[PDB]
Protein backbone atom coordinates (compact mmCIF):
# COMPACT_ATOMS: atom_id res chain seq x y z
CA UNK A 1 0.00 0.00 0.00
CA UNK A 2 1.42 3.40 -1.51
CA UNK A 3 0.11 6.63 0.31
CA UNK A 4 -0.22 9.88 -1.01
CA UNK A 5 3.54 10.63 -1.19
CA UNK A 6 4.85 7.60 -2.70
CA UNK A 7 5.84 6.01 0.77
CA UNK A 8 4.42 2.08 1.47
CA UNK A 9 2.79 2.12 5.27
CA UNK A 10 1.19 -1.38 4.91
CA UNK A 11 1.53 -4.29 3.65
CA UNK A 12 -0.80 -8.04 2.75
CA UNK A 13 1.33 -11.46 2.60
CA UNK A 14 -0.79 -13.14 0.87
CA UNK A 15 0.16 -16.68 2.30
CA UNK A 16 -0.01 -15.23 6.06
CA UNK A 17 -3.83 -16.49 6.44
CA UNK A 18 -7.11 -17.25 4.94
CA UNK A 19 -7.89 -13.51 5.65
CA UNK A 20 -4.93 -11.91 3.76
CA UNK A 21 -5.60 -14.65 1.39
CA UNK A 22 -8.73 -12.91 0.73
CA UNK A 23 -7.52 -9.69 0.80
CA UNK A 24 -4.71 -9.92 -2.03
CA UNK A 25 -7.95 -11.20 -4.56
CA UNK A 26 -9.93 -8.38 -3.90
CA UNK A 27 -7.03 -6.25 -4.11
CA UNK A 28 -7.93 -4.33 -0.83
CA UNK A 29 -6.98 -4.05 2.85
CA UNK A 30 -10.99 -3.94 3.24
CA UNK A 31 -12.58 -6.72 2.95
CA UNK A 32 -16.63 -6.60 3.14
CA UNK A 33 -18.98 -8.96 4.57
CA UNK A 34 -19.48 -12.29 2.52
CA UNK A 35 -17.77 -15.42 1.05
CA UNK A 36 -15.13 -15.25 -1.55
CA UNK A 37 -13.76 -17.77 -3.46
CA UNK A 38 -9.71 -16.54 -3.10
CA UNK A 39 -7.80 -20.20 -3.90
CA UNK A 40 -7.15 -23.79 -4.44
CA UNK A 41 -6.80 -26.56 -2.41
CA UNK A 42 -4.14 -29.03 -3.78
CA UNK A 43 -3.00 -32.08 -2.38
CA UNK A 44 0.70 -32.77 -2.82
CA UNK A 45 2.78 -35.97 -4.20
CA UNK A 46 5.27 -37.05 -1.58
CA UNK A 47 7.36 -38.92 -3.19
CA UNK A 48 8.31 -39.91 -7.33
CA UNK A 49 7.59 -43.23 -9.09
CA UNK B 1 16.43 -17.26 21.36
CA UNK B 2 13.69 -16.63 18.84
CA UNK B 3 11.47 -13.08 17.91
CA UNK B 4 8.37 -12.38 16.25
CA UNK B 5 9.13 -10.41 12.76
CA UNK B 6 5.85 -8.77 13.21
CA UNK B 7 5.52 -7.07 9.75
CA UNK B 8 9.19 -6.16 9.38
CA UNK B 9 11.24 -7.18 6.29
CA UNK B 10 9.25 -4.91 3.69
CA UNK B 11 11.22 -3.14 1.30
CA UNK B 12 10.67 -1.24 -1.96
CA UNK B 13 10.54 -4.18 -5.04
CA UNK B 14 11.73 -1.75 -7.67
CA UNK B 15 12.86 1.91 -8.57
CA UNK B 16 9.70 3.33 -9.83
CA UNK B 17 7.82 5.97 -8.15
CA UNK B 18 3.46 4.63 -6.96
CA UNK B 19 1.08 6.32 -4.84
CA UNK B 20 -2.00 5.53 -4.02
CA UNK B 21 -2.23 2.45 -5.12
CA UNK B 22 -2.30 -0.95 -3.94
CA UNK B 23 0.63 -2.78 -6.01
CA UNK B 24 0.73 -6.53 -5.99
CA UNK B 25 4.29 -8.01 -6.30
CA UNK B 26 6.51 -11.06 -6.17
CA UNK B 27 9.82 -10.71 -4.20
CA UNK B 28 11.61 -12.20 -1.79
CA UNK B 29 10.13 -10.81 1.72
CA UNK B 30 10.24 -12.11 4.71
CA UNK B 31 7.02 -13.28 5.67
CA UNK B 32 5.26 -11.98 8.34
CA UNK B 33 4.88 -13.36 11.84
CA UNK B 34 7.85 -15.27 10.90
CA UNK B 35 10.29 -16.54 13.54
CA UNK B 36 13.55 -14.92 13.47
CA UNK B 37 17.13 -15.71 14.97
CA UNK B 38 17.88 -13.53 18.32
CA UNK B 39 21.09 -13.05 18.60
CA UNK B 40 22.65 -10.98 22.24
CA UNK B 41 25.91 -8.78 22.83
CA UNK B 42 25.87 -8.91 26.25
CA UNK B 43 28.40 -10.22 29.27
CA UNK B 44 27.45 -14.00 19.29
CA UNK C 1 15.75 15.00 -25.70
CA UNK C 2 17.41 14.47 -22.14
CA UNK C 3 20.48 12.79 -21.22
CA UNK C 4 23.15 12.98 -18.55
CA UNK C 5 25.36 16.13 -19.17
CA UNK C 6 28.75 12.99 -19.38
CA UNK C 7 31.32 13.85 -21.58
CA UNK C 8 34.00 10.45 -20.35
CA UNK C 9 33.71 8.31 -23.01
CA UNK C 10 33.32 4.53 -22.33
CA UNK C 11 36.81 2.17 -22.54
CA UNK C 12 35.48 -0.15 -24.95
CA UNK C 13 39.46 0.20 -26.32
CA UNK C 14 40.57 -1.57 -23.16
CA UNK C 15 38.16 -4.62 -23.59
CA UNK C 16 38.51 -5.29 -27.40
CA UNK C 17 42.06 -4.52 -27.86
CA UNK C 18 43.68 -6.13 -24.74
CA UNK C 19 47.21 -7.87 -24.64
CA UNK C 20 45.15 -10.80 -23.71
CA UNK C 21 42.03 -12.83 -23.11
CA UNK C 22 40.89 -14.46 -20.19
CA UNK C 23 40.05 -18.50 -20.25
CA UNK C 24 36.57 -19.53 -20.80
CA UNK C 25 36.98 -21.53 -17.62
CA UNK C 26 37.71 -18.14 -15.65
CA UNK C 27 36.13 -15.38 -18.29
CA UNK C 28 36.40 -11.69 -16.95
CA UNK C 29 33.83 -9.65 -16.39
CA UNK C 30 34.41 -5.75 -16.49
CA UNK C 31 31.90 -3.26 -15.79
CA UNK C 32 31.16 0.36 -18.03
CA UNK C 33 29.66 2.85 -16.42
CA UNK C 34 29.66 6.42 -15.92
CA UNK C 35 30.44 7.31 -19.97
CA UNK C 36 29.26 7.96 -23.14
CA UNK C 37 29.37 4.50 -25.00
CA UNK C 38 29.33 4.87 -29.03
CA UNK C 39 28.32 1.95 -30.63
CA UNK C 40 28.74 2.97 -33.99
CA UNK C 41 32.37 2.51 -33.99
CA UNK C 42 32.13 -1.12 -32.76
CA UNK C 43 28.84 -1.96 -35.23
CA UNK C 44 30.55 -0.06 -38.28
CA UNK C 45 34.01 -2.47 -37.68
CA UNK C 46 34.89 -4.24 -40.36
CA UNK C 47 37.34 -6.34 -38.07
CA UNK C 48 34.61 -8.55 -36.09
CA UNK C 49 33.44 -11.75 -37.50
CA UNK C 50 29.87 -11.70 -36.09
CA UNK C 51 28.16 -8.79 -34.13
CA UNK C 52 25.03 -10.72 -33.39
CA UNK C 53 22.01 -9.23 -31.21
CA UNK C 54 19.76 -10.84 -28.91
CA UNK C 55 18.40 -8.09 -27.07
CA UNK C 56 18.03 -4.65 -28.75
CA UNK C 57 18.86 -4.34 -32.55
CA UNK C 58 22.28 -2.73 -33.19
CA UNK C 59 21.34 0.73 -34.47
CA UNK C 60 18.87 1.64 -31.71
CA UNK C 61 22.06 1.46 -29.26
CA UNK C 62 22.93 4.70 -30.08
CA UNK C 63 19.79 6.17 -28.92
CA UNK C 64 19.25 4.03 -25.70
CA UNK C 65 20.67 3.55 -22.74
CA UNK C 66 21.56 1.42 -19.52
CA UNK C 67 21.60 1.39 -16.07
CA UNK C 68 24.61 -0.41 -16.41
CA UNK C 69 26.88 -2.32 -19.16
CA UNK C 70 28.96 -5.37 -18.68
CA UNK C 71 31.53 -7.26 -20.81
CA UNK C 72 32.51 -10.38 -20.31
CA UNK C 73 35.65 -10.95 -22.01
CA UNK C 74 37.52 -14.75 -23.26
CA UNK C 75 38.82 -16.97 -25.61
CA UNK C 76 37.29 -19.71 -27.24
CA UNK C 77 37.42 -22.15 -30.28
CA UNK C 78 35.99 -21.08 -33.33
CA UNK C 79 33.03 -23.48 -33.91
CA UNK C 80 31.56 -22.72 -30.75
CA UNK C 81 31.33 -19.08 -31.28
CA UNK C 82 27.85 -20.80 -32.11
CA UNK C 83 26.98 -21.42 -28.38
CA UNK C 84 27.10 -18.42 -26.95
CA UNK C 85 23.58 -17.63 -26.91
CA UNK C 86 20.58 -17.30 -25.25
CA UNK C 87 18.43 -20.81 -25.97
CA UNK C 88 21.65 -22.74 -27.19
CA UNK C 89 22.71 -25.67 -25.42
CA UNK C 90 25.74 -27.64 -25.89
CA UNK C 91 29.58 -28.73 -23.98
CA UNK C 92 30.34 -24.59 -23.76
CA UNK C 93 26.61 -23.27 -23.35
CA UNK C 94 25.87 -25.61 -20.51
CA UNK C 95 29.26 -26.42 -18.52
CA UNK C 96 31.62 -23.62 -19.04
CA UNK C 97 29.51 -20.13 -19.78
CA UNK C 98 26.27 -19.66 -19.77
CA UNK C 99 23.77 -17.14 -20.62
CA UNK C 100 20.16 -15.99 -19.66
CA UNK C 101 17.90 -17.52 -22.17
CA UNK C 102 15.98 -13.83 -21.62
CA UNK C 103 19.52 -12.49 -22.56
CA UNK C 104 19.69 -8.77 -23.12
CA UNK C 105 22.30 -7.70 -25.30
CA UNK C 106 24.82 -8.81 -28.09
CA UNK C 107 27.65 -11.17 -28.98
CA UNK C 108 30.52 -10.03 -30.33
CA UNK C 109 33.56 -11.71 -32.05
CA UNK C 110 36.32 -11.68 -34.12
CA UNK C 111 38.88 -14.46 -34.74
CA UNK C 112 42.98 -14.18 -33.00
CA UNK C 113 44.78 -16.67 -35.61
CA UNK C 114 47.24 -13.74 -36.39
CA UNK C 115 47.78 -13.15 -32.72
CA UNK C 116 47.00 -15.61 -29.72
CA UNK C 117 47.57 -18.91 -32.34
CA UNK C 118 51.34 -19.83 -32.07
CA UNK C 119 51.11 -24.27 -29.99
CA UNK C 120 49.01 -21.69 -27.29
CA UNK C 121 48.09 -23.87 -24.54
CA UNK C 122 47.35 -20.93 -22.19
CA UNK C 123 43.34 -21.46 -22.82
CA UNK C 124 41.45 -23.81 -20.63
CA UNK C 125 37.78 -24.57 -20.46
CA UNK C 126 35.18 -26.61 -18.26
CA UNK C 127 23.74 -21.51 -13.94
CA UNK C 128 23.46 -17.84 -16.07
CA UNK C 129 27.02 -15.65 -15.89
CA UNK C 130 28.49 -18.48 -13.46
CA UNK C 131 32.25 -18.90 -12.97
CA UNK C 132 33.19 -21.99 -12.57
CA UNK C 133 37.29 -21.41 -10.76
CA UNK C 134 39.67 -37.76 -14.18
CA UNK C 135 39.40 -34.38 -14.64
CA UNK C 136 36.59 -31.75 -16.45
CA UNK C 137 39.49 -29.73 -16.99
CA UNK C 138 40.27 -29.13 -20.81
CA UNK C 139 42.35 -27.16 -22.69
CA UNK C 140 43.65 -26.26 -26.50
CA UNK C 141 46.58 -25.52 -28.37
CA UNK C 142 45.70 -23.08 -31.18
CA UNK C 143 48.19 -23.11 -34.08
CA UNK C 144 48.02 -20.52 -37.33
CA UNK C 145 47.05 -23.49 -38.90
CA UNK C 146 44.48 -25.00 -37.85
CA UNK C 147 38.89 -21.68 -39.38
CA UNK C 148 36.93 -23.82 -36.80
CA UNK C 149 39.80 -24.83 -34.73
CA UNK C 150 41.17 -21.37 -34.62
CA UNK C 151 40.71 -19.32 -31.76
CA UNK C 152 38.06 -16.58 -31.14
CA UNK C 153 37.99 -13.54 -28.92
CA UNK C 154 34.97 -12.99 -27.88
CA UNK C 155 32.92 -10.35 -25.51
CA UNK C 156 29.40 -10.39 -24.56
CA UNK C 157 27.80 -7.26 -23.87
CA UNK C 158 25.38 -7.07 -21.17
CA UNK C 159 23.01 -4.48 -21.03
CA UNK C 160 20.79 -3.71 -18.14
CA UNK C 161 17.90 -1.78 -19.15
CA UNK C 162 15.89 -2.17 -15.90
CA UNK C 163 14.25 1.25 -15.91
CA UNK C 164 16.41 3.11 -13.20
CA UNK C 165 19.17 6.14 -13.41
CA UNK C 166 21.05 5.48 -16.38
CA UNK C 167 24.89 5.90 -16.54
CA UNK C 168 25.73 4.54 -19.90
CA UNK C 169 24.25 6.69 -22.60
CA UNK C 170 24.79 7.30 -26.40
CA UNK C 171 26.50 9.96 -28.33
CA UNK C 172 22.98 12.03 -28.55
CA UNK C 173 23.53 15.62 -27.64
CA UNK C 174 20.26 16.94 -25.49
CA UNK C 175 18.06 19.84 -26.23
CA UNK C 176 16.55 22.53 -23.82
CA UNK C 177 13.37 21.31 -22.27
CA UNK C 178 10.04 22.98 -22.83
CA UNK C 179 7.37 23.09 -19.79
CA UNK C 180 4.12 23.44 -20.49
CA UNK C 181 3.62 22.76 -24.32
CA UNK C 182 3.06 19.59 -26.08
CA UNK C 183 6.43 17.79 -26.85
CA UNK C 184 7.60 14.83 -28.33
CA UNK C 185 10.49 13.39 -25.29
CA UNK C 186 13.04 11.49 -24.87
CA UNK C 187 14.27 10.58 -21.29
CA UNK C 188 17.38 8.83 -21.03
CA UNK C 189 15.90 6.81 -24.11
CA UNK C 190 12.39 6.49 -22.94
CA UNK C 191 9.97 7.97 -25.45
CA UNK C 192 6.12 9.31 -25.44
CA UNK C 193 4.75 12.27 -26.52
CA UNK C 194 2.90 14.61 -23.77
CA UNK C 195 2.76 18.17 -22.07
CA UNK C 196 5.61 18.23 -19.02
CA UNK C 197 4.76 20.21 -16.03
CA UNK C 198 6.07 21.08 -12.74
CA UNK C 199 5.42 18.62 -10.06
CA UNK C 200 4.15 18.31 -6.12
CA UNK C 201 5.66 14.17 -6.60
CA UNK C 202 8.28 13.33 -4.07
CA UNK C 203 10.70 10.57 -5.70
CA UNK C 204 12.61 9.18 -3.32
CA UNK C 205 16.36 10.13 -4.46
CA UNK C 206 16.74 6.07 -6.03
CA UNK C 207 13.62 6.93 -8.11
CA UNK C 208 13.88 7.26 -11.65
CA UNK C 209 10.56 7.12 -13.29
CA UNK C 210 6.89 6.93 -12.26
CA UNK C 211 3.82 4.85 -13.63
CA UNK C 212 0.26 4.43 -13.60
CA UNK C 213 -2.26 1.67 -13.74
CA UNK C 214 -1.38 1.40 -17.25
CA UNK C 215 2.14 0.68 -16.67
CA UNK C 216 2.44 3.95 -18.70
CA UNK C 217 4.41 6.84 -17.40
CA UNK D 1 0.29 -6.93 -19.57
CA UNK D 2 2.88 -8.82 -22.35
CA UNK D 3 0.96 -11.44 -23.74
CA UNK D 4 4.54 -12.60 -24.86
CA UNK D 5 6.02 -10.01 -25.99
CA UNK D 6 9.17 -8.49 -24.42
CA UNK D 7 7.39 -5.54 -23.00
CA UNK D 8 3.95 -4.67 -22.41
CA UNK D 9 5.16 -1.13 -23.44
CA UNK D 10 4.78 0.17 -27.16
CA UNK D 11 7.46 2.78 -27.42
CA UNK D 12 9.86 0.27 -25.65
CA UNK D 13 9.65 -2.03 -28.21
CA UNK D 14 9.30 0.13 -30.90
CA UNK D 15 12.74 2.30 -29.31
CA UNK D 16 14.64 -0.98 -29.39
CA UNK D 17 13.66 -3.25 -32.51
CA UNK D 18 14.33 -2.77 -35.89
CA UNK D 19 10.74 -2.99 -37.88
CA UNK D 20 11.55 -6.65 -38.88
CA UNK D 21 11.60 -7.65 -35.30
CA UNK D 22 9.23 -4.88 -33.75
CA UNK D 23 6.33 -6.02 -35.87
CA UNK D 24 6.46 -9.31 -34.10
CA UNK D 25 6.57 -8.27 -31.02
CA UNK D 26 3.92 -5.38 -31.42
CA UNK D 27 1.66 -8.13 -33.01
CA UNK D 28 1.75 -9.85 -29.87
CA UNK D 29 0.55 -6.85 -28.25
CA UNK D 30 -2.07 -6.52 -30.62
CA UNK D 31 -3.50 -10.12 -30.33
CA UNK D 32 -3.97 -9.36 -26.74
CA UNK D 33 -5.25 -5.80 -26.45
CA UNK D 34 -7.81 -6.70 -28.90
CA UNK D 35 -8.93 -9.66 -27.75
CA UNK D 36 -9.04 -7.08 -24.27
CA UNK D 37 -11.00 -4.90 -25.94
CA UNK D 38 -13.56 -8.09 -27.98
CA UNK D 39 -14.07 -9.34 -23.80
CA UNK D 40 -14.84 -6.16 -22.24
CA UNK D 41 -16.90 -4.59 -25.22
CA UNK D 42 -19.38 -8.27 -24.89
CA UNK D 43 -19.42 -7.99 -21.59
CA UNK D 44 -20.80 -4.31 -21.59
CA UNK D 45 -23.73 -5.52 -24.39
CA UNK D 46 -24.80 -8.24 -21.55
CA UNK D 47 -25.09 -6.36 -19.37
CA UNK D 48 -26.57 -3.57 -20.41
CA UNK D 49 -29.26 -5.88 -21.76
CA UNK E 1 17.76 0.55 22.61
CA UNK E 2 17.98 3.83 21.06
CA UNK E 3 18.36 3.27 17.37
CA UNK E 4 16.77 0.28 15.04
CA UNK E 5 18.77 -0.09 11.33
CA UNK E 6 17.07 -2.89 9.31
CA UNK E 7 18.77 -4.31 6.54
CA UNK E 8 18.12 -6.72 3.77
CA UNK E 9 20.81 -8.55 1.88
CA UNK E 10 20.07 -10.47 -1.25
CA UNK E 11 21.60 -11.93 -4.15
CA UNK E 12 20.20 -12.34 -7.64
CA UNK E 13 22.20 -13.54 -10.76
CA UNK E 14 25.85 -12.24 -8.79
CA UNK E 15 24.13 -8.35 -8.08
CA UNK E 16 24.11 -7.92 -4.34
CA UNK E 17 21.37 -5.76 -3.39
CA UNK E 18 21.23 -4.02 -0.19
CA UNK E 19 18.18 -2.25 1.25
CA UNK E 20 17.98 -0.51 4.66
CA UNK E 21 16.37 1.82 6.67
CA UNK E 22 17.39 3.53 9.91
CA UNK E 23 14.73 5.03 12.68
CA UNK E 24 15.10 5.66 16.66
CA UNK E 25 13.72 3.84 18.97
CA UNK E 26 13.30 3.81 22.65
CA UNK E 27 13.22 0.02 23.46
CA UNK E 28 15.87 -2.52 24.79
CA UNK E 29 14.21 -5.79 25.52
CA UNK E 30 13.30 -6.95 21.69
CA UNK E 31 12.25 -6.13 17.71
CA UNK E 32 9.62 -2.83 17.99
CA UNK E 33 6.27 -3.85 16.78
CA UNK E 34 5.44 -1.21 13.63
CA UNK E 35 5.77 -0.88 9.99
CA UNK E 36 8.48 0.71 8.03
CA UNK E 37 9.28 0.27 4.63
CA UNK E 38 13.18 0.11 3.19
CA UNK E 39 15.12 1.87 0.09
CA UNK E 40 17.28 0.42 -1.92
CA UNK E 41 20.67 2.13 -1.22
CA UNK E 42 23.22 -0.41 -2.72
CA UNK E 43 23.66 -3.02 -5.70
C1 LIG F 1 3.63 14.11 2.62
O1 LIG F 1 4.73 14.90 3.17
C2 LIG F 1 4.28 16.15 3.83
C3 LIG F 1 5.53 16.88 4.30
O2 LIG F 1 6.20 17.52 3.22
C4 LIG F 1 3.32 15.80 5.01
O3 LIG F 1 2.84 17.00 5.61
C5 LIG F 1 2.12 14.98 4.46
O4 LIG F 1 1.23 14.63 5.53
C6 LIG F 1 2.66 13.69 3.79
N1 LIG F 1 1.56 12.88 3.24
C7 LIG F 1 1.24 11.67 3.67
C8 LIG F 1 0.10 10.97 2.99
O5 LIG F 1 1.86 11.12 4.59
C1 LIG G 1 8.47 -20.11 16.30
O1 LIG G 1 9.10 -20.59 17.52
C2 LIG G 1 8.14 -21.08 18.53
C3 LIG G 1 8.95 -21.48 19.76
O2 LIG G 1 9.44 -20.33 20.44
C4 LIG G 1 7.33 -22.27 17.93
O3 LIG G 1 6.36 -22.73 18.88
C5 LIG G 1 6.61 -21.80 16.64
O4 LIG G 1 5.88 -22.89 16.06
C6 LIG G 1 7.66 -21.28 15.62
N1 LIG G 1 6.97 -20.79 14.42
C7 LIG G 1 7.45 -20.90 13.18
C8 LIG G 1 6.61 -20.34 12.07
O5 LIG G 1 8.54 -21.43 12.95
C1 LIG H 1 40.88 -1.28 -31.66
O1 LIG H 1 41.99 -0.71 -32.41
C2 LIG H 1 41.66 -0.36 -33.80
C3 LIG H 1 42.94 0.15 -34.47
O2 LIG H 1 43.80 -0.93 -34.82
C4 LIG H 1 40.53 0.71 -33.82
O3 LIG H 1 40.16 1.02 -35.16
C5 LIG H 1 39.30 0.13 -33.07
O4 LIG H 1 38.24 1.10 -33.06
C6 LIG H 1 39.70 -0.23 -31.61
N1 LIG H 1 38.55 -0.84 -30.92
C7 LIG H 1 37.83 -0.23 -29.97
C8 LIG H 1 36.68 -1.00 -29.37
O5 LIG H 1 38.09 0.91 -29.59
Known amino acids: ?49 | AYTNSFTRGVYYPDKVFRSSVLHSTQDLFLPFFSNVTWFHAIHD | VRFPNITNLCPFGEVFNATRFASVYAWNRKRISNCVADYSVLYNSASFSTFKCYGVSPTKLNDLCFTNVYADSFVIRGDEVRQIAPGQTGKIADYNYKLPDDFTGCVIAWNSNNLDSKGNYNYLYRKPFERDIYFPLQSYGFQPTNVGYQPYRVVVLSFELLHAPATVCGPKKSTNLVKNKCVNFNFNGLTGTGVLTESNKKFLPFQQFGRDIADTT | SNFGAISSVLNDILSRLDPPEAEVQIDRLITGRLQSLQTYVTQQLIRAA | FKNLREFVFKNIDGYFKIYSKHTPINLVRDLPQGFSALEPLVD
Open chain 1, 1 to 49: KYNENGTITDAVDCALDPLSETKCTLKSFTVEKGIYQTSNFRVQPTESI
